[PDB]
Amino acid sequence: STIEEQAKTFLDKFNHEAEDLFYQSSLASWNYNTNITEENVQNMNNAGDKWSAFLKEQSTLAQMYPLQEIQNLTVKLQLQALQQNGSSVLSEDKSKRLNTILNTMSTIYSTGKVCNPDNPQECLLLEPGLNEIMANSLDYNERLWAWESWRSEVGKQLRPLYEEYVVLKNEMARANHYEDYGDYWRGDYEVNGVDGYDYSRGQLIEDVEHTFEEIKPLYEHLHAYVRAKLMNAYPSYISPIGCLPAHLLGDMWGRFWTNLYSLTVPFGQKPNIDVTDAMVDQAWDAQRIFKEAEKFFVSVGLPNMTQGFWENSMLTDPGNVQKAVCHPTAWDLGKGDFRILMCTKVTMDDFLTAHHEMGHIQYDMAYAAQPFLLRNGANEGFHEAVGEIMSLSAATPKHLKSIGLLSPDFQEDNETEINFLLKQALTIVGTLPFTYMLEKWRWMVFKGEIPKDQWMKKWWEMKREIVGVVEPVPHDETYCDPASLFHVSNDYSFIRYYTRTLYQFQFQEALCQAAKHEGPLHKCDISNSTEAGQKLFNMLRLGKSEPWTLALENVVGAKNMNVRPLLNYFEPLFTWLKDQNKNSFVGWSTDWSPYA
């Protein structure tokens, strides 16, 4: 018979067997998460190992189907997903060495501690000592010491491990018909076989560079504003023309500028929008929060949560005997089993993250009719973008007035809008240069453009060129500062955080084009609008069955990632910054250093 007919039945069997095994593994992991016992750990390890062994055996079996004689797009996608060799192509000794290297790197990252001399006992881990010191202390010397000590007591144990990891991953990628590991990671956005909706693996770099170039001026103005505020904070440590030292950007690595908000408030006489008091006063619990979230999602036409979600999910910290992780997460075990794990507290932040996780659950519920191999977002940026759009819709003052939570006498003025847009930009704008820079450095290190003996020398060059961040203490080649970050030392892609930040702003305005919104884009709400809900559901229900270009076009009317809606969103703050920067200088000089 035809090869596609010989593969259809194989796919059916794989689906019917993988559903049960994935359900077993997910159930075991959930039981571990909600109840930490030794038997739970053993059960979860056994289930995970069984699922992984079955997956590997099925992939080995599937590798025998010639893809060159199959034309159906869905079957081609499923078999291409199932036919990956992975790291098995590498030799057994090399594979064992790679696994040992990865485990050692993760253990060093998550186990090392830092302490000053003459205190060999009281040594702080990364949390909650280093993070709190970075995000709360205003002492220059203490911050510098913490930064340099964390980067000097860890990178030494990472540099040779990282070099061997780079070599092994590069040879593994080359053995699997790829140019290098960077190409292997870029292959997630690759689209082929569809006429008029194709995407090249090398086009991602070009698109990212174009988007960053057209973004640049807003980041320059924001950096000038932040630099002026920091200079006013530190009278004799920051030059009026220099870049920003790396040990003064809120957290350890300067990924987010959120913690800078307390030092960059435009109008400090008007308090922020904190509605914790109204949350506490009206006798409001976690169940009420989730019912409000469900009502908000119902108001746009999306279905409501089932009884199993209410019965099985854990929406409150158990306390007493049970010990559970409090990181919120939307679990999709499969077969109609959806749950949300979170330690709810009476706070507006929990109110927003409830909407985030419920959007995750709704998107998981949307594509439950797809085959097992296509039950995920179109690419690695769609899913969190759909998560964040719900929070953006629900954070507006109009929605908070639509739930009877704020006094109707509260009238929004331009000062509060400026404060809100600056707070949003200190998280959205302040991370795109960092993400792009780190991904570019890793890509070109894998490609081989940077020789080893020059790695650090290139890494801190872009900090002066792109991010505009300077080094407080000179660094030698033996350091491995970039490896100190979480994602790089755990073999994680780091470009998904870029495209997502754009994709959401493309979706938002598109939905607001069906909500008939009049006015600025920073106050649009999709509530009580069935057209926007239907437009969103059209994209959500597709899952991975179609190229992500088609999914993007089905909502925004464009076949490529774009950033113009982001600038449209930030136009008011952009104009305010342009007016305020009449005396401050836009730009920075790379040759400036604090130590000269």
């Binding site: 018979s1 007919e5 010989q6 039945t9 194989f10 059916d12 069997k13 019917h16 049960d20 359900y23 159930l27 025998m64 089932t306 009884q307 199993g308 099985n312 075990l333 077969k335 109609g336 089993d337 959806f338």
Partner: protein, 195 residues
């Protein structure tokens, strides 16, 4: 004044598998559907051919008491002119089907933690099903171009799969018990009228 044995079928401890669905032939008694017509202890009742609104005055030759248990979302497939997994590999109803179907949830009974591998259903078949046909074969399904030699291997599968019913499924995956009462009438005195 013989009451037809409808009482002992609904509340049986266990029902057979989907591909071994149980049948009962009922004749020469009195069956009253008004007991379940206005009581509502079930969840779903629907049917074709005969209107439930007091049409037991007619006479039928025999009553078929088909019974089995399936997945929830497959309850839609027990209907005339339907196509799917059940309608192609497990049970196929005639296009002009006359009779009634009652489906109700059975999560408190047929659901066990860590799975309830006791219910079997066919997944692969070489053809379709003629109306009112039985399948009790255990032959290995051939999908490739080589003999299977009676063992599972390349392009050789076991045609039966087990429902892993566990009390934490969604409403779609939860077990549903289905009873099909078929009123077969032909050229006969048709003593089974049910006054």
């Amino acid at each position: 004044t013989n009451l037809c044995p409808f009482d002992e079928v609904f509340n049986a401890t266990r029902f057979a598998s989907v591909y071994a669905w149980n049948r009962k032939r009922i004749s020469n008694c009195v069956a009253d559907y008004s007991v379940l017509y206005n009581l509502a202890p079930f969840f779903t009742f629907k049917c074709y051919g005969v209107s439930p609104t007091k049409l037991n005055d007619l006479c039928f030759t025999n009553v078929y008491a088909d019974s089995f248990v399936i997945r929830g979302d497959e309850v839609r497939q027990i209907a005339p002119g339907q196509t799917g997994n059940i309608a192609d590999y497990n049970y196929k109803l005639p296009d002009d089907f006359t009779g009634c179907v009652i489906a109700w949830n059975s999560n408190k009974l047929d659901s066990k933690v860590s799975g309830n591998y006791n219910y079997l259903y066919r997944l692969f078949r070489k053809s379709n099903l003629k109306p009112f046909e039985r399948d009790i074969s255990t032959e290995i399904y051939q999908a490739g171009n080589k003999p299977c030699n009676g063992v599972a291997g390349f392009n050789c599968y076991f045609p039966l799969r087990s429902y892993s019913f566990r009390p934490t499924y969604g409403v779609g995956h939860q077990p549903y018990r289905v009873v099909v009462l078929s009123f077969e009438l032909l050229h006969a005195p048709a003593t089974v009228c049910g006054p």
